[PDB]
Design a binder for this molecule. Structure first.
Ligand SMILES: COc1ccc(S(=O)(=O)NCc2cccc([C@@H](NC(=O)c3cccc4c3-c3ccccc3C4=O)C(=O)O)c2)cc1
Length: 291
């Protein structure tokens, strides 16, 4: 369990960013690591087999704006990024989840189109294949995995921001709606902690949110927990040692550098560190510290 860091990749502040930085909760330190080959905001991060993957996004630059179909792999032992097989389609404002060593890429945008499509990556074959599409087109969608089921929560379908959510059952290659959240959320942070899917922050169409709600998969209900100290949309999120960490985002005024930490036992959020600069639209995941 020891020696794991919270990695933040990419993001946006004035333009899409190439940063890869890693935070050590045990000592409060940040390390700046190898830049992404291509700056990207609106991407997702995940880890399989100790390797960090950066998936999708968009390069917003002064010289153009290009949605990304890329999958890039970072090896902490070498501090190097390597390209992996690209997805079938560019996916900005993507969500990803990992089931049994496979990466699922969910939704996202390409230009004006809002995807319902979903595809699955096999690291052992370096191949992607499409699986069943969601019941709803979703960009800015939160994705998490609990009990080897994939959840897609909230987002924006091209016309409305969504409180709806749905679950993918891999053995049937089928999506089913679940109870909708109490709040419309696009660009929330979605993660799993114990037996619940948490949806933190986001944008409801009017304001960035500090509220946080959790879906208990046994009871099929969404319940609010303590709100974050900051309203935030387009935040990064991960879980580490039984606590939720939220990173950055936008509060309606400022690109946040705040990192907050939720303790489920006390139902409290605390400020734990600040990123080296404020940013939104990051990918986040946890893996071994680099060499
Ligand atoms: C060209 O500039 C960029 C490019 C990329 C990014 S990004 O990579 O962070 N992706 C943004 C995002 C992902 C997911 C969801 C949302 C939701 N929008 C809001 O919260 C929102 C609403 C009104 C004004 C603003 C925002 C907002 C959000 C973040 C930073 C600044 C702002 C505003 O100034 C939603 O549209 O539902 C946005 C950020 C800026």
């Amino acid at each position: 369990k020891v020696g794991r860091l919270i990695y933040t990749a990419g993001g946006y502040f004035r333009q899409s960013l190439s940063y890869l930085e890693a935070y050590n909760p045990s000592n409060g330190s940040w390390l700046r690591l190898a830049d992404l080959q291509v700056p990207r905001s609106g991407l997702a991060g995940c880890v399989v087999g100790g390797l960090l993957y950066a998936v999708g996004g968009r390069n917003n630059s002064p010289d153009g704006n290009t949605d990304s179909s890329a999958l890039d792999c970072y090896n902490p032992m070498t501090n190097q990024w390597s390209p992996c097989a690209s997805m079938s389609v560019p996916r900005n404002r993507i969500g990803v989840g990992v089931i049994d060593g496979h990466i699922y890429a969910v939704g996202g945008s390409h230009g004006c189109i809002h995807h319902s499509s979903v595809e699955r990556y096999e690291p052992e074959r370096d191949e992607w294949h499409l699986v069943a599409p969601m019941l709803t087109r979703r960009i800015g969608v939160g994705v998490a995995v609990l009990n080897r089921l994939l959840y897609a929560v909230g987002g924006f379908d091209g016309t409305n921001r969504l409180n709806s959510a749905e679950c993918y059952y891999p053995e049937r290659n089928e999506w089913r709606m679940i109870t909708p959240m109490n709040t419309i959320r696009s660009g929330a942070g979605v993660c799993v902690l114990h037996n619940c899917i948490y949806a933190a922050g986001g944008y409801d169409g009017q304001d960035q949110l500090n509220s946080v709600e959790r879906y208990d998969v046994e009871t099929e209900t969404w319940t609010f927990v303590a709100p974050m100290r900051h309203h935030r949309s387009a935040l990064g999120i991960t879980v580490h040692q039984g606590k939720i960490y939220v990173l950055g985002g936008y509060d309606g005024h400022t690109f946040l550098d705040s990192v907050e930490c939720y303790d489920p036992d006390s139902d409290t959020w605390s400020e734990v560190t600040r990123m080296t600069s404020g940013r939104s639209g990051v990918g986040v995941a946890v893996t071994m510290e680099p060499c």
